[PDB]
Amino acid sequence: SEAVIKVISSACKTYCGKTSPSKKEIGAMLSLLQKEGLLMSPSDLYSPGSWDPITAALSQRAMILGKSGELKTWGLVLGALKAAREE
Ligand SMILES: O=P(O)(O)O[C@H]1[C@H](OP(=O)(O)O)[C@@H](OP(=O)(O)O)[C@H](OP(=O)(O)O)[C@@H](OP(=O)(O)O)[C@H]1OP(=O)(O)O
């Protein structure tokens, strides 16, 4: 995607600051969400209810395969979006 990623970058850096995820991480993780059939479009990230299955799926593959690559990026984006949705 293009716009969706930029929207996240300007948002996460407002909460996490310098501890925010890199654009390269977001862009790569987004494709993972689609390939896994978790989300149809990157814009689906605006749905807070859909965060539950995604987070669960990520933690599952992380504890089973031993890879938290997408989990690390998701955790940051999730936290930023969660805080934003709380306001
Ligand atoms: O030119 P800008 O409007 O200031 O945006 C850039 C650009 O991001 P986009 O390609 O999504 O517009 C950089 O991407 P690249 O040119 O390196 O491919 C990205 O760098 P990273 O992908 O390595 O994160 C950088 O972010 P940063 O300044 O944290 O290095 C980010 O700048 P902004 O985050 O301030 O928009």
Indicate which technique resolved this structure.
NMR
> Which range of residues forms the domain containing residue 28?
1-87
CB atoms within 10 A of CB 30: 21
- Contact status, residue 59 vs residue 71, Cβ threshold 8 Å: yes
Buried-exposed string 31-59: b where 16+ CB fall within 10 A, e elsewhere: ebbeeeeebeebeebeeeeebeebeebbe
Residue matched to tokens 């989990």: 71
DSSP 47: -
Q: Which atom of ligand 1 is nearest to the CA of 20?
A: 29
Of 49, 50, 9, 46, the closest CA to residue 27 belongs to: 9
- Residue ranges lining ligand 1, Cβ < 6 Å: 5-6, 9, 22-24
Tally of domains within the chain: 1
